[PDB]
Structures are given as structure tokens and as C-alpha cells.
Design an enzyme around this catalytic site. Structure first.
Site, PDB file in Angstrom:
ATOM      1  CB  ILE B  33      17.889  92.927 -63.718  1.00 56.08           C
ATOM      2  CG1 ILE B  33      18.998  93.880 -64.171  1.00 56.08           C
ATOM      3  CG2 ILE B  33      18.555  91.798 -62.912  1.00 56.08           C
ATOM      4  CD1 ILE B  33      18.511  95.069 -64.963  1.00 56.08           C
ATOM      5  N   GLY B  94      21.360  76.768 -58.292  1.00 52.39           N
ATOM      6  CA  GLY B  94      21.711  78.030 -58.922  1.00 52.39           C
ATOM      7  C   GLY B  94      21.104  79.248 -58.226  1.00 52.39           C
ATOM      8  CG  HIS B 101      13.823  84.126 -57.047  1.00 46.67           C
ATOM      9  ND1 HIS B 101      14.652  83.980 -55.960  1.00 46.67           N
ATOM     10  CD2 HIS B 101      14.585  83.856 -58.136  1.00 46.67           C
ATOM     11  CE1 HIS B 101      15.859  83.635 -56.367  1.00 46.67           C
ATOM     12  NE2 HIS B 101      15.846  83.555 -57.684  1.00 46.67           N
ATOM     13  CG  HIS B 103      13.586  82.180 -62.597  1.00 46.27           C
ATOM     14  ND1 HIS B 103      14.363  83.263 -62.911  1.00 46.27           N
ATOM     15  CD2 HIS B 103      14.153  81.504 -61.569  1.00 46.27           C
ATOM     16  CE1 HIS B 103      15.382  83.222 -62.074  1.00 46.27           C
ATOM     17  NE2 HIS B 103      15.298  82.178 -61.247  1.00 46.27           N
TER      18      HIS B 103
END
Lengths: 115, 115
Positions: B33, B94, B101, B103
């Protein structure tokens, strides 16, 4: 020659030493020669896979093994507040050595974007 | 509730939509997003694992599966020049959403250090 024919292959066959943190039949973990954070080590497979885009489906467990070993070594090194794992692929990814390696960095607040 | 009780759980149960790229019985890939590069998507497991430091040894294949799916989706998206895979753990890493997940960023030269 086992371990491949890169700088990592020499470390694997122990032709050249490294600050080895952990080793098993599948992989080896050692500190980075140019750390980017207080704690910065690599986890590499003993099997020569030149890059992630070249891994086969059969390589799943082994790739998953690097992250598991990475999280274990990170615990031993006392990275209580967290860390970042990074795999670089190709030129845009920033890969210079063509033998898959996972970076584990910690000991400081990692920023965003990740490069 | 399956898929866990984070924002990702809702995406998994399809309670909220996302730009889904790929899906199988084990995981799901969708665009970020807040992309940090021309191409920036996530690969998440359907099984709720809150963070990498909490993955069990039995989770190896599944963790390895995320990287394999990530490299496949990256190919479909045409990331010919490479990419960077990132897993954030905890505050220093972070991590804001407590559901593992991965990235996958590409489409531009990734820099160093990775944050």
C-alpha cells in the site's frame, strides 16, 4: 570443488578463515567483513546456488533453513530488540558475489526504505 | 479466526481486498500500500506466525516457500535486473504488523546499507 567457486566457496572449504558463528551440514554463518550495523552477519548455504532467482522448488527447505539459523544466531548474539534479514538478487538488488547469502543486521534501529 | 488477527488476517479471509498477485494453499502475495520502489509487494504465510523469531523448525519449508513464490512473482512482474527481499523483525527491524511478511522491492537500484 564443493561450495562453488566464489569467495564463499573458499570459506566453506576453509581455504580462508572467517569469524564463523555457526555451521552444520547445510549452511554456515559468519560476520560480515564490512558490517553496516553493530551486528551484521551472513548465513550462506554450503550448496552452490548462485542467486535466489536460480533456486529450484526443491531448495525451499534449505532456503527456509537459512532464516531459521539466522534467527537462532541472532538470539545468541543477543539481538533482543530485533533485526533485518536481507537477500540481494542481481544488479538492482546489489548482489556482487554470486552465491546466495542472507544478511542479518541488528543492534541499531533499521530505517526505511531498506535502501 | 484463521489467518490471525492482524490487518493481514483480514486480507487472507478476504474480509478486505488487496491487489493480489498470487495465492496458493500456503501463502498469498499482494502489492504494498506504500511502495518504496517501482515494484514493491509482500508475500505472507496464511498460517499465523507473528514474527520470524517465533517460527518453529517445522516452519522451514513454509519460510522457504515465501522466497520461492517471491522470486516467481518477481519474474512475472518482469524484474529482470534484480530485486531485494526483506524480512523485518521487532522494533529495531521495523516490524509494525505482527504477522510475518517478506518484502520484495525492485524496478530501481537498491542502495546500501539496507536502511
Amino acid at each position: 570443488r564443493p561450495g562453488g567457486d566464489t569467495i564463499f566457496g573458499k570459506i566453506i572449504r576453509k581455504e580462508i578463515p572467517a569469524k564463523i558463528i555457526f555451521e552444520d551440514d547445510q549452511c554456515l554463518a559468519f560476520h560480515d567483513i564490512s558490517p553496516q550495523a553493530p551486528t551484521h552477519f551472513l548465513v550462506i548455504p554450503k550448496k552452490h546456488i548462485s542467486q535466489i532467482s536460480a533456486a529450484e522448488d526443491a531448495d525451499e527447505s534449505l532456503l527456509g533453513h537459512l532464516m531459521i539459523v539466522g534467527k537462532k544466531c541472532a538470539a545468541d548474539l543477543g539481538l533482543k530488540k530485533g533485526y533485518r534479514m536481507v537477500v540481494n538478487e542481481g544488479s538492482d538488488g546489489g548482489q556482487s558475489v554470486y552465491h546466495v547469502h542472507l544478511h542479518v543486521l541488528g543492534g541499531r534501529q533499521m530505517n526505511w526504505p531498506p535502501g
